[PDB]
Amino acid sequence: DRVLRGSRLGAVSYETDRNHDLAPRQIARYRTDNGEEFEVPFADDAEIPGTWLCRNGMEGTLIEGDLPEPKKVKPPRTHWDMLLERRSIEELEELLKERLELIRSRRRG
């Protein structure tokens, strides 16, 4: 019960498109693992991050020898962990000896 008037979620300004001066800027050279190089022009006064998500789609590091060592998290949950939270070492060793005796009796009896 209205008029179909659409608008994309974003504004359109118009200022002076001058290219004679800009802000000064650096260029950081990022490198992924598979021999790729990438250039990302940051500004001058900009804290350049040691890692970066590259255009290729993989997390590339910075080519300067920073060596940040971010100390990543543990692998979340294993089947061994879900076994160990409900069993104990001696009971698992008991079932291990049970299956060892069964494979022995199947092998030579």
């Binding site: 979620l9 255009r55 290729n56 789609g57």
Partner: protein
Amino acid sequence: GAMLDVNFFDELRIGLATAEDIRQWSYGEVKKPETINYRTLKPEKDGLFC
């Protein structure tokens, strides 16, 4: 050839594009099936509208 399309053309070559051309055209790899944040109506990170 041309990429800024100055209306000075003499050919239009079609071709069967390889994966090395596909990942050379693209600017970033989309990796999430999201379009727009439901509350602030901003384009989501790493979505189809990032």
